[PDB]
Ligand binder design. Sequence first.
Ligand SMILES: [Mg+2]
Ligand SMILES: [Mg+2]
Lengths: 136, 141, 176, 94, 44
Amino acid sequence: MLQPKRTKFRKMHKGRNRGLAQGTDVSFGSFGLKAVGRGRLTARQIEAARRAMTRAVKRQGKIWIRVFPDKPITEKPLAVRMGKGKGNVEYWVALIQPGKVLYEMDGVPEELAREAFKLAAAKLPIKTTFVTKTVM
Amino acid sequence: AKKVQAYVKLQVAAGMANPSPPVGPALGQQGVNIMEFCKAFNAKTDSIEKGLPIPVVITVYADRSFTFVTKTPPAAVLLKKAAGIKSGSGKPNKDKVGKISRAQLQEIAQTKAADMTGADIEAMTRSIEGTARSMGLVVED
Amino acid sequence: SRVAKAPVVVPAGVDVKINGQVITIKGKNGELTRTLNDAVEVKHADNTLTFGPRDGYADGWAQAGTARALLNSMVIGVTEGFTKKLQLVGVGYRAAVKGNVINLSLGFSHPVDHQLPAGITAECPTQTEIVLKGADKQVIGQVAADLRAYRRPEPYKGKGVRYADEVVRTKEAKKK
Amino acid sequence: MFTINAEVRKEQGKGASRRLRAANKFPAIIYGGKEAPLAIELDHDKVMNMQAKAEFYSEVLTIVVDGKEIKVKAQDVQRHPYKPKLQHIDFVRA
Amino acid sequence: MKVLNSLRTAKERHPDCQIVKRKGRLYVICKSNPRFKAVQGRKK
RNA sequence: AGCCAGGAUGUUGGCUUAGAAGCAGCCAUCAUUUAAAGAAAGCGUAAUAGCUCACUGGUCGAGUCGGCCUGCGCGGAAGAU
Ligand SMILES: [Mg+2]
Ligand SMILES: [Mg+2]
């Protein structure tokens, strides 16, 4: 499960998820899986989706993961009074804005990359689309 | 040729002419009198040899039993006796289970100018080899 | 559409009355009558029947393409007539003809009877062979569902009433 | 070898360009050499398909603008953030 | 027959599948092998 | 898309080979008579088996196919006087 090894601080203001994405072209492979909807990816979701593509391609083809949790999510457990301090870190998320290239792939034919990245889309909480390397 | 009246083939290398444990009923469940297996087979298979596995045809008539005709040994069984290992494939092209050659093969392919679909001497040289290749073979003529 | 573009032939004997959207086509074996959908144009003259659309009705080509396959079948039925074929399979199964009543004994405590509709009559050669003869095609398939629905084909012994164009696939009696 | 038909822009800034894309067109620009930049407006569907063959990004294209001809090369491109379209393109009078 | 709200996996299992409309919903017949029979929906 | 049939051979491909012949397996993915034809996707299990099938040929005669930019609507959609 991906997670920052260390961070300066345990806990983080909620913040927002405004604006558009920076990762919008396929920058390492030949094909890519791109985020369309807006939202937060948990580390467990990213791992479940990463598995789907690796099942499908055997031990062939290389995969890059362009997003990284980085943001800690806290929660107060059951039966707790409000106030009394910020929750305990339970899992880690990455903030995703539309256009972020999430996954890339190269080493399989385009037809198989679409199938392989697709057997992943059912694991993600935001709509996605298949994108390709582009000249310039 | 003509239409089907049940003719296939069920047996291994000529170690038994009429065997109980090997095939069983499956060769005499139709009209095959298990007696002709040795009373026709020996009555005729003491003419080429009684030691390579040969697949034959089967002809059952409304009268008594059947007459089968043989013709050529299988291409794959030929490799166990004089080409490589004891059984054949097993672990094919992972390692290099041998080095036969086009020469050893041809003498048991050209001699099949009727039961070996092919009006080309050359074809048999590589066609019989087609059977002999999956067992991981480097051809070194 | 492509059905619709090919008109229908009317040989001799045929009658063709076209009161707007009512049709009566008669020949040597009936007086078949049908109310035509509004959104259609079966035209006359020549020796044909073109099936086109009418301006102001949406579908139209699906509607006039249906009249093609309908009047097509009608013209055949008033000349040559239609014949289905239910062959009986499954022991203790009777079939005999007492006029226009079909005698069925298909394993039940009560021999089922079936009264035949208008022009769809029928008969039997034996106790396992039924053969119907009629004019309408919408009705012979209908009689064939009634006669067939009584005892449907069980898929383990292929028993019951079956079409003669019928494929009775079977499966194995479980395992162990 | 590809020839693009363009009209000169009468406005500029975010409003017109979002209005252009709202009008199924999109802006682009021609700069380079000694002469001044040339603000242009393009038909969207035509250039999307052109640039879908690598030849677009390495050949000298011809822009036809008010029935004249400016020889340029594609230099940079802004693509839609996540849809298959285009927001803007740079051409250089090279 | 099962329901499910997604016929993308129904229409490919056996070749004899085609998808029709029928009533308000969207059914997936197979009178060839009646095992592969899907519906898409509830009622009122 | 219908439909005529063809869909023949190396070949039980050898194979941990209980029958494994495509056909519950191990792997391999050759090359044969060619308009075609896999050591084979499937009904199947005593095993061929049988027929559709992947592929072409004869026929049919002006269109077929479904992905983009999108407007609108269908399924998903069960609670208690
Ligand atoms: Mg504003
Ligand atoms: Mg209803």
